[PDB]
Design a protein around this ligand. Structure first.
Ligand code: PJH
Length: 164
């Protein structure tokens, strides 16, 4: 069903998260973590304190798809177990901010062709697939985008709801 999913997304904030490669999304899916540049780290930390759920919607550049979505479970922190991200050419690990813990809500993909009817008011009402890394997606567009993903029957949102 979709009811617990709608409950998790109620009054959420949503952010488009870009990855240069599939490897980093695979790491994020396996380890429940993400790390971004300080400019976006600061925005996500502010958002985490502001809303009952903050949703990251992931897209690998040039893939033509979203690879899933997850909810922040923490503000960023430093000093944890290192993560061997594959970073863009010319980027060292020290250029990243801290590490956010995330709980995956859907690990299934969604092709951009399926979201062509959704526009993001916070990016000039351009199609929601369009945006820089860290672009916020307004509530209604973000909710509808998440509801387009195929249901992920491997995930139980009971555990997510309790963290809220
Ligand atoms: C795992 N994180 C990354 O790959 C990245 C790279 C540049 C900017 N933001 C995030």
């Amino acid at each position: 069903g979709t009811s617990k999913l709608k409950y998790v997304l109620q009054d959420a904030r949503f952010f488009l998260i870009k990855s240069n490669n599939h490897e980093n999304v695979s790491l994020a899916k396996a380890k429940g973590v993400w790390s971004t540049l300080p400019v976006n780290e600061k925005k996500l930390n502010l958002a985490f304190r502001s809303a009952r759920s903050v949703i990251l919607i992931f897209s690998v550049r040039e893939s033509g798809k979203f690879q899933g979505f997850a909810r922040l479970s923490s503000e960023s922190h430093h000093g944890g177990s290192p993560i061997h991200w594959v970073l863009p050419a010319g980027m060292s690990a020290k250029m990243l901010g801290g590490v956010f813990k995330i709980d995956w809500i859907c690990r299934r993909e969604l092709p951009f062709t399926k979201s062509a009817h959704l526009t993001n008011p916070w990016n000039e009402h351009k199609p929601v697939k369009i945006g820089r890394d860290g672009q916020e997606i307004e509530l209604e567009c973000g909710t509808q985008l998440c509801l387009l993903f195929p249901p992920d029957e491997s995930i139980d949102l009971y555990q997510v709801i309790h963290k809220m």
